[PDB]
Amino acid sequence: TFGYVHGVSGPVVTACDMAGAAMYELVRVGHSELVGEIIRLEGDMATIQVYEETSGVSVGDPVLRTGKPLSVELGPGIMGAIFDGIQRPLSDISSQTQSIYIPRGVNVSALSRDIKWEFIPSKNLRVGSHITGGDIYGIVNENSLIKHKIMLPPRNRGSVTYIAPPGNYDASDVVLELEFEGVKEKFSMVQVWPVRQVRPVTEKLPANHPLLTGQRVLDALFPCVQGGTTAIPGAFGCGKTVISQSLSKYSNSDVIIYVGCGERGNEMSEVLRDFPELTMEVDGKVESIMKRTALVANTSNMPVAAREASIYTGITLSEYFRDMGYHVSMMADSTSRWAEALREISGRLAEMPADSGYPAYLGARLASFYERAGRVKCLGNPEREGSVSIVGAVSPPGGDFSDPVTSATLGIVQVFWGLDKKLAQRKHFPSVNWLISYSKYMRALDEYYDKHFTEFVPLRTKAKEILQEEEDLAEIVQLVGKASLAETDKITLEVAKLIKDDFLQQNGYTPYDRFCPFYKTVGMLSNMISFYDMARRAVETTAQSDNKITWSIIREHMGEILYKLSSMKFKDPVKDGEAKIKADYAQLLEDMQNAFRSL
Amino acid sequence: YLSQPRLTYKTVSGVNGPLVILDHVKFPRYAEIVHLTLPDGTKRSGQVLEVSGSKAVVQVFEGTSGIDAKKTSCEFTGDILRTPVSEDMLGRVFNGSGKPIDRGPVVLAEDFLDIMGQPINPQCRIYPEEMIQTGISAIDGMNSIARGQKIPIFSAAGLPHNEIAAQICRQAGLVKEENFAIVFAAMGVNMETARFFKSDFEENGSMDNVCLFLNLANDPTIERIITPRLALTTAEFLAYQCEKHVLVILTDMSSYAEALREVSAAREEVPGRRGFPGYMYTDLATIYERAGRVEGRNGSITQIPILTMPNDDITHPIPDLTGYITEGQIYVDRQLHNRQIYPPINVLPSLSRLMKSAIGEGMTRKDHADVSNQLYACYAIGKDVQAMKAVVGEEALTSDDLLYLEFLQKFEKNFITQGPYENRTVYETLDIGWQLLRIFPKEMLKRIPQSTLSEFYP
């Protein structure tokens, strides 16, 4: 049957004559085919949110119904392209229309129906065997960097009847036919999945491997774990987008899905421009990093309703690739934008408001979304171990942490990277407020450091204590000037200041600091702490002597050595061997030892 | 007992959020339980929250999704919800709705008990007087508890309150049966919390005497309304019927509050402070006081719920209302956690009704109250002088001020700072307290009477 457009108001549309409808069913409204979802029923009337700008819609316009809920088409061809809030390849659309603007009711296939794909069936696939879901039954070298696997969709089982031979195949060509109870059914290399349904798993597993970030600050002090979760609040201009870009460029993961919702499209242009040039080395081959990334975008000026759809689509794709046997991370940008969209839709429904005008179920939705993370043993007889990590970014209005959005997110994630506006004002570009930041993955990670970098463990603790002690003095320094403190205090203050100016600071846009390997950070911290304790012990041992070593004497003795220690950060990961920089650090340490003993 | 054939209704006149509005129901009953069939074979359940005329309102436990006005049907039972009850509930785990989450089958309901409980005469209740040893010096001593009391644990996000709960459950015992059975209930937690608690419980081999429930973050929100009451009903049965001394651990009551907010906002009922509905004061009264001994019976109910604290707001509605009901509170502060203190417990805002439980005559020792009070006052003055220190430099302080600062420092370094798995005895903590007292001379013992002072100080 077909409904009719009883009334319109903003992005919401009431439709009569919809007796057979149900919640969360896709619908089409207008003479143009505007996609939407149902959100409220009342007798024969219904309510529809629409993902297109609403204008030029009459009453009584026909409305079509379909029993399919919102879904995404999953398969090859995804990477290297870009999609809208709903699954719609922008590049294909732009080639189709030959214009600048997106048509109001453009409708094109999610994936190409003409590209050909090589195929290799499994070496254990015999006629009459059973796989009962989750088993890979073929391989496709979609791109040189990453090879797409195809597995039986879940909730499927039955004996093998037909197997496609090795070779080339286009979409919708019969790959595998399966017979269970006298019913025959065919599958291709593309399938469908509802967006809001959680993909089943065999079991969730604990985190056991660190996920590096390429920043001296984050890896050293507030590390994140593979398969974990986190959030990054902070006012505008604190460089959240920069951190997201750096993580996407230099992670340890295989595949990265960047979901930008409600931002400038110039960021999308930056991603489109920079990533193709940059290359990364695995398997003895150098490949443009676009092959290992997929991009979902929703510019700010687009209609409000699509934004939730974008956030859901992104995690659905991440899920599909976690099932594939890879570690993947996500860059969820500005989930507060999603909150804003919820606020608007609830506003047009005359629903009772909650704190700060947001709907009541904001917390529930955020918890449900962030729960999907975690390491996973997957379904299937050939066991694989995958994982999903979500690195969310929050944008609290006013720059404080009182809005319900941020407080809600704090109660779910395990790692928290606060940013402070004054620090970014300082041009301390990676503005991380170590004081407020914290991480709850300190445990279940000490084994990794004990197995590789055992010395790092005391070192970081010492640095943290030094930072805290600096803070604990700074207020009394500010209230009352100097010349009222012991030598140890001023020494600790000054070394903490140099830590601040050098170690914490990191300019990722110079060619030589775009990325910092972990061992460089370890060596830097080792040199710093060695110098600190050596100086402190030296001055302490002369406390009761006839010649008390003061800080001015230390400066006169070691100004040039301090200068070299400051310039220590000028070590390019390329064009300079690991061995030579390590030897340079060792030689500097020996110099520090000699200068101390000479005194 | 028997009943007539049940009735099917297909008159779904609307759907709105977690609610479903029907009509043309014949003789609807308030708080009646119903079932729901979907266009597929999937089944659900719910209850009735409102009734008027032939119209009725139906809350759905599993949420709302794909509901139709042409295929979905409804079934009406004949009475309030009544749930399985048996001794076999131990050694088993269940979801938010009490179905078996492990592979074991549906428990055999030796009896059926009303979820809503039933009132008890105040005259037929007995004061709880037996101090329960915990081993934490911050809890034993300053804020001693008894067998039958209830104490919430105020905490904020990012704090290790779960570790504290595990430590308490491990070392629970009596000062001088064998131990307590455990009725644990989770209210919308992530997999980490549940897994950690499971690991802790199986570490001590206490699964033979734990019945546990699980409501995870992925589950439908509405289930949290019913989840804790099941655990409380089961615990009530084990305590007042099997005469077993039980310990019920609730957690994340804020999620319960959120679910209640959902229900109220859906019904467009009059809101109050911060959009919270008015009547959760009554509701929290219902969920909280189900504890304490009774005349002529053995066993007891000790209830330790855990409440997360939005931001750092002591005046927030949820913790404030919980303050008006429970007889105590144990506070957690992020300051101590930043200072690397494994039990980060700010003793100043904490308080309990050890008020006549830890007498000493017959109980542990006679000096208990005096030492507790003197430590409390000295700690308060220590915080005061610490605040004064940030104003004027160290040189302006008198000798007594430095003594207070040193006493404070050594106090958190020794008394508060306790390592995990450390089972301190009450006598040990009293002795530690005395050693801390010895820092000052006897003349600053403004609170200890003469007799105890001359008895122990030398």
Binding site: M352, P353 | P271
Partner: peptide, 13 residues
């Protein structure tokens, strides 16, 4: 104020 005004307006029906 906003919440109260909303419920008041709804009270008409």
């Amino acid at each position: 104020f906003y919440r109260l005004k909303k419920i008041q307006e709804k009270k008409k029906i």
